[PDB]
């Protein structure tokens, strides 16, 4: 849970701000990093659990 | 020890944690405590560096 607050290289730890503040294309760009961070942490958690 | 923090505010910079424990730098070192109950007939110039 605590992983997701880390603003993973993005402008913010939440997404709609990214959508609102900049044009969708760039907002997509930034959110990609958050997306990757979240899933990656999931992966590590998953492997640990397994 | 024994102080109950009748009104003491933890210094949350944006949003306050409701419950838990946090290690942080807060001004808990006490200098020249003044506790005057319901009296201030004073024209005072509190100055730092002193």
């Amino acid at each position: 849970t605590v992983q997701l607050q880390h603003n993973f290289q993005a402008i913010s730890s939440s997404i709609d701000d990214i959508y609102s503040r900049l044009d969708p294309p760039s907002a997509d760009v930034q959110v990609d990093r958050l997306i990757t961070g979240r899933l990656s942490a999931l992966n590590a958690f998953v492997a640990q659990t397994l | 020890e024994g102080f109950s923090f009748n009104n003491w505010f933890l210094l949350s910079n944006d949003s306050t944690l409701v419950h838990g424990k946090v290690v942080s730098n807060q001004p808990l070192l006490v200098n020249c405590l003044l506790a005057i109950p319901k009296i201030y007939g004073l024209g005072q110039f509190f100055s730092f560096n002193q």
Binding site: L22 | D14, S15, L17
Partner: protein, 200 residues
């Protein structure tokens, strides 16, 4: 929802006047801009709306104006209930001020930029980049409790359902989750706290 405060708006304009193109559309003539008629400005009113104005003409024809953004925001976004504890615009270099540039492309495409705009600002609910001078005496905030709704709770955008929670947290205003999610925010105007639930 932001801090209770006097209904105060100041229209931000920043007029940019330029002439490009020359002969065969590949030349330039002039370019300048001001923040509401001045080279710099700072918002004091709680509300403020940018109204970008353009006296930009290609001597050969039309000018395509493209926006640069070295800023956490866009001109179309700042008015969208963006919140600051301060916000200042300079036409010249300003320390720790994000950059927004404009590029004027004439019909034959000189490709030049407009003046760099520098925005030194700090987040807060003191002044709000507004789309329109907000209404409401002593408070411009509005909410729909028990309603799945958009919100900007002291800058906390999002979607959720607002339910009065009878809690009486003396300290703090809006408390976030352990996972950095705003769980309850106090009206503070009434000193009452509302829990927020994601709609889905």
């Amino acid at each position: 929802v932001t801090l209770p405060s006097f209904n105060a708006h100041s229209f931000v304009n920043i007029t940019v006047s330029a002439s490009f193109g020359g002969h065969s559309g590949a030349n330039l003539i002039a370019s300048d801009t001001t923040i509401n008629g001045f080279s710099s400005f700072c918002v004091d009113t709680r509300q403020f709306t940018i109204s970008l104005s353009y006296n930009v003409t290609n001597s050969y024809g039309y000018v395509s104006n493209s926006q640069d953004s070295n800023c956490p925001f866009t001109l179309q976004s700042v008015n969208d209930y963006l919140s600051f504890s301060k916000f200042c615009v300079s036409t010249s270099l300003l320390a720790s001020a994000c950059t927004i540039d404009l590029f004027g492309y004439p019909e034959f495409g000189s490709g030049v930029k407009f003046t760099s705009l520098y925005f030194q600002f700090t987040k807060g609910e003191l002044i709000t980049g507004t789309p329109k001078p907000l209404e409401g005496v002593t408070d411009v905030s509005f909410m729909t409790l028990d309603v799945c709704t958009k919100y900007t709770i002291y800058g906390f955008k999002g979607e959720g359902i607002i339910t009065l929670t009878n809690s009486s947290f003396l300290a703090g205003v809006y408390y976030t989750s352990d996972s950095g999610q705003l769980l309850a925010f106090k009206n503070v105007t009434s000193g009452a706290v509302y829990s927020v639930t994601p709609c889905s």
